[PDB]
Point group: D3
Chain length 81, copies 6
């Protein structure tokens, strides 16, 4: 949905800002702090997509038993990777 796109757009804005921080010779801690914030915000989108995908696989199973087996397995594999 459209909540991810806002969050991705922000991360993208922060990434170009961090570019300006390196190209202006800012220090290790200021740069790492911002990069970590970008990293967590991307990870949070990843987690939300994985969570929603696994929820829908559990909550709305396919008719075919083997198909539903393979679909849950793929959803869970993302959870533990």
């Amino acid at each position: 949905n459209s909540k991810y796109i806002t969050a991705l757009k922000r991360s993208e804005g922060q990434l170009r800002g961090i570019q300006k921080m390196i190209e202006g010779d800012r220090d290790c801690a200021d740069i790492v702090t911002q990069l970590t914030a970008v990293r967590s915000s991307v990870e949070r989108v990843i987690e939300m997509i994985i969570t929603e995908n696994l929820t829908e696989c559990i909550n709305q199973p396919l008719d075919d038993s083997e198909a539903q087996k393979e679909r849950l397995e793929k959803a869970i594999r993302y959870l533990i990777k």
Copy 2:
């Protein structure tokens, strides 16, 4: 040189974020969206690790001549590695 390498990587990553944005607007494939999101996450983490690694390295390789300054400097460098 070091710093240009970082900026190339970060510009790749922000480019991939825009691509991923277009995917989600299209209700495009969910397994693909996670794969490329993970690729962005990994490349950002790569830059983080390189910066922390270089910082710690030059703490060890180029110690400060004030001993208390050097203790505090190394502690911060190691804590960045820990976190």
Copy 3:
């Protein structure tokens, strides 16, 4: 669960146990090992709770499909954290 409250007593007592050793200038390797054990015992309570909550969520779903979806999402989100 008095399951958890006995485990939280062990850990809490282990913490003041550790605290004597730091007061003691005592063996640094021991102190870390003992702190790590406290950390793990707390974590296993955390994992037991979130496991139970997701189990109840899967086995006893809400009546309303949308409510159950939001409920599953939150239960799953507690898994992918540490």
Copy 4:
């Protein structure tokens, strides 16, 4: 089919362990030795995750008809995922 897939992977891994053994006896390259050790570790972890994933999947997809049995079964399946 499932089980043959696992055995192929595990036999690859034990083969790579013997290769790594020969490397260390030769005082061979340390960066290579870690890379391939990590590859073995990853492939073993892949088998672990597949087994835990399938176990959890068939807990959900094929629930037990005793309700208390099914609660205990699912709890163990999720705890394997957690650990």
Copy 5:
């Protein structure tokens, strides 16, 4: 360090704090959050100790090169754990 002993008091008190809530059949989401905070506060003491020990190991090496090697190895091994 009385640095650590104040932190270990907060955590230990937070644990019996949590324990009231489990006795309370209290909000499950809160309980996990509060346990996670205890887990993190213990971990940060762990990381502070191992960071200090490796710092002292790098800055104040032993006289004997082999002894220093074994000493560095053990200090580094405490990093790569969780």
Copy 6:
């Protein structure tokens, strides 16, 4: 050194045993327990090699400053990967 080879040989023995466990239709928990033990023993060799390598880079630096910089960085990168 030769302590790694003993440990690797054991892991290799356990891996073929786990093969016999699957090919004899043993259950999820027994198989996972053994595979986890193999995984930790491999990881422990990895950690020991990384630890020793980083120790020697710190304890026995190269003469050249840039060379020593790149060598420590590679050693530390393995530590945090």
